[PDB]
């Protein structure tokens, strides 16, 4: 039972539902593809996001837009959580909220092939 | 309740037959045997199963099934108890001849007219 | 708690054609006990009684 | 895009990826044999969470000769332009939420399929 | 006037912001000081963060990407025209900095999700012929199966045989 | 439930299941084998050292990698088995009566892999090809069911049941 | 002998309505009702009709 003004209007109740509902990457992720991109500036894929920000592999975990808007998330908190949960061992280069594709770039810095598979799973 | 059952007045159970005449009749046609066949040729083909035994491969189900149906209608090589399956979504022809397959007789309708004429 | 399922491949009975979600093809008995019943709806009513 | 298994050339076994630390490139090695070959796809694994599979790729031309499949004349074919044609749902489990039909031309030597 | 800074990181961030604001040549048309605006944005970011940590660098990169995004130059034009004060731009979020089309699409998606999260109301024949004993009101809905009575405002539940 | 034709021996069951969870590791429950064995070791034991042959027997088309990403985990899982002898030893080690020596285990494994499993296809001296093809068809059907491209088989469908009248009962 | 006419008319109207719902679902117009999928809302609408 809602207590605040959210009890009357549904606009301030949807966020309450979203925060009380379990959301994971699987619910917001659409595709996940691993690439063995040698040079981080090389960018085998055509994406104008890396050189502005600046290991021979990365994970391109692109997120869906409709689900992300339904749960009302932002890439900042997603990056913060994905970086803090696994310690200061990776470097997630998030994307701005203006491009059409919600692509991401997860890289590891410091057997190693399957580590990315295990961590993504 | 629901476990004990009784047959219908027309329900009939197949007594059982032998698969050898069917195997011979299907072997005479242009049917490559499963022991000597290119594995890449299985995709665009239909797998024939007789009594649950995968044997042979064919390349023309639409004619093979019609030939089998006509042959069964004529009652010369295949008894009336044998049943030929045609799986359209996946190309598989599963034929069964063992006993216990409950069945019943049904009239045949070619296009829009039955064969049970006044004669 | 649901309509008559597709016991066969995507159809209730062999009489009805595939992908036939019509009322009479899923258990809706249109007739009444005074005016008799269609065999298909008769069978479905037997299913409900069971 | 997707990724295919490429068997070895001598032993004909699976080739696992290997990042060449020396030349800084992607290789596919054999565990049993010592065969090597330079990669060209630059991809190893892709996961489709939404599982956006095109049902048309699974549909075959043989579905037309189905005696227990509905037929309509109001959706003629495109290539040949035949009138008679069949229609049916995905007929596949895991159907997310859609009963969108997949019209298939019912005519020999055409086997065309489309959707409206 | 934004105070000058002797920090190398702050100077680099200010230069990057000024370069990004110069994209499209909107400054010449508007006659706005790109360097001053970049310095003000950097100062506002530094005041908000109070350190040149990873958060400050991420915020600077996000601001540069938003200002240099060719898919919505209206935000950059408004920033260079004084429509968005530098403090507001520095404190603005990604959703607020999005273009008009992107903002409309996000609002439509949020509205659709809010609607879909709802639950369908229980059906019934609403009428005022039955007086609910739990609230004294006349509005209510009935259902024949025995006729179940469901109160509209009070919500009194009863049945009549 | 395999059964040749009213044979002296009872019907044998072959459960080719898959773990839910790496993930997606296919197993098998062969008769007279308490533990589970992956399908790939079984294929190698039937006389298929090459991986391409095993995949061709299992998967008929290689133009669909989406089906193929499912079999890669299990196929990588049992990689320390290439020759036929080690596969026979591995399968015989899980037998109900493990031979004290190696030759007895090999003989037991060969006997269980040529008479106990799938007796209906053939129990003659040279019938490993048809057994391997039947097992590959089984794995293909399992993979299709897992992908959802083909709905599951209903248990109560009388089309998959048989009646035992006075004849078979006596 | 008039109630039969009314019942037949009502049944025909219900059949026409369910056919129209099926046509709309086929051509992708019936939007999913909140809290339910497309098949669930289609079935609920048919049952209510
Ligand atoms: Zn090799
Ligand atoms: Zn055509």
From Swiss-Prot, chain D:
Xref: Pfam families: Zn_ribbon_RPB9, Zn_ribbon_TFIIS
Positions bound to Zn(2+) 2: 77, 80, 105, 110
Highest taxon of the lineage: Eukaryota
Gene Ontology MF annotations: DNA-directed RNA polymerase activity; nucleic acid binding; zinc ion binding
Ranges annotated as TFIIS-type zinc finger: 73-115
InterPro entries named among the record's database cross-references: DNA-dir_RNA_pol-M_15_CS, Rpa12/Rpb9/Rpc10/TFS, Zn_ribbon_RPB9, Zn_ribbon_RPB9_C, Znf_TFIIS
Binding-site positions, Zn(2+) 1: 8, 11, 30, 33
UniProt KW keywords: Acetylation, DNA-directed RNA polymerase, Metal-binding, Nucleus, Transcription, Zinc, Zinc-finger
Zinc finger residue extent: C4-type: 8-33
Example GO BP: transcription-coupled nucleotide-excision repair
Predominant cellular place of this UniProt entry's protein: nucleus
Signal peptide from the UniProt entry: none
Function: DNA-dependent RNA polymerase catalyzes the transcription of DNA into RNA using the four ribonucleoside triphosphates as substrates. Component of RNA polymerase II which synthesizes mRNA precursors and many functional non-coding RNAs. Pol II is the central component of the basal RNA polymerase II transcription machinery. It is composed of mobile elements that move relative to each other. RPB9 is part of the upper jaw surrounding the central large cleft and thought to grab the incoming DNA template.
Subunit (UniProt): Component of the RNA polymerase II (Pol II) complex consisting of 12 subunits.
Record family assignment: Belongs to the archaeal RpoM/eukaryotic RPA12/RPB9/RPC11 RNA polymerase family.
Protein name as it appears in the record: DNA-directed RNA polymerase II subunit RPB9
Organism name: Sus scrofa (Pig)
Gene symbol of the encoding locus: POLR2I
UniProtKB/Swiss-Prot annotation, chain E:
Binding site for Zn(2+): 132, 135, 151, 154
GO biological process, one term: positive regulation of transcription by RNA polymerase II
TM segment ranges: none
Keyword match Isomerase: no
Residues covered by the TFIIS central domain: 9-125
GO molecular function: DNA binding; zinc ion binding
Family: Belongs to the TFS-II family.
Disease: A chromosomal aberration involving TCEA1 may be a cause of salivary gland pleiomorphic adenomas (PA) [181030]. Pleiomorphic adenomas are the most common benign epithelial tumors of the salivary gland. Translocation t(3;8)(p21;q12) with PLAG1.
Protein name per the record: Transcription elongation factor A protein 1
Organism from which the protein derives: Homo sapiens
Upper taxonomic lineage: Eukaryota, Metazoa, Chordata, Craniata, Vertebrata
This protein's encoding gene: TCEA1
Included range, full protein: 132 to 301 of 301
